[PDB]
Design a protein around this ligand. Structure first.
Ligand code: CL
Ligand code: CL
Length: 162
């Protein structure tokens, strides 16, 4: 298992514009297009991302390409963030993939707001961090996915992902 397979499981793959769990227009592997209510704005953002007139539909390769770019950006966002970097560097490989998933889902900004959990993960207090991460809107809005990431931060193995 690796970060790409992990996020492919959590996000799914859809080739036509769709609405995510917060109702925002998305495509592919969890690639958010816009928070605007307009489908037309969504379609415009998609053509601009792909470089062609897609008419709201993309191919598998194109979805994979947006995915590679989004994973890369997530990593780089983490490495550039002063609150995130130290955590990420203190973690083992499996757990670093956990932090990339949260950032891919909720943004740098969002993850960096989990100050207390961050401090517990940096200290390697696994069960404590797991309990604090669950006290969040993230856990209450997407519990199945949050449970998989939290269990992975707790055990350091890929078991939750079968
Ligand atoms: Cl893009
Ligand atoms: Cl979920």
């Amino acid at each position: 298992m690796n970060i790409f397979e992990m996020l492919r499981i959590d996000e799914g793959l859809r080739l036509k514009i769709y609405k995510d769990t917060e109702g925002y227009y998305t495509i592919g592997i969890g690639h958010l297009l816009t928070k605007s209510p307009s489908l037309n704005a969504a379609k415009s953002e998609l053509d601009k991302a792909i470089g062609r007139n897609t008419n709201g539909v993309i191919t598998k390769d194109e979805a994979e390409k947006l995915f590679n770019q989004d994973v890369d950006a997530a990593v780089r966002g983490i490495l550039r963030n002063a609150k995130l970097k130290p955590v990420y560097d203190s973690l083992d490989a499996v757990r670093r993939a956990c932090l990339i998933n949260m950032v891919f889902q909720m943004g740098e900004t969002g993850v960096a707001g989990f100050t207390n959990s961050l401090r517990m993960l940096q200290q390697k207090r696994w069960d404590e961090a797991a309990v604090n991460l669950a006290k969040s809107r993230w856990y209450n809005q997407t519990p199945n996915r949050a449970k998989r990431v939290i269990t992975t931060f707790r055990t350091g193995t890929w078991d939750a992902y079968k």
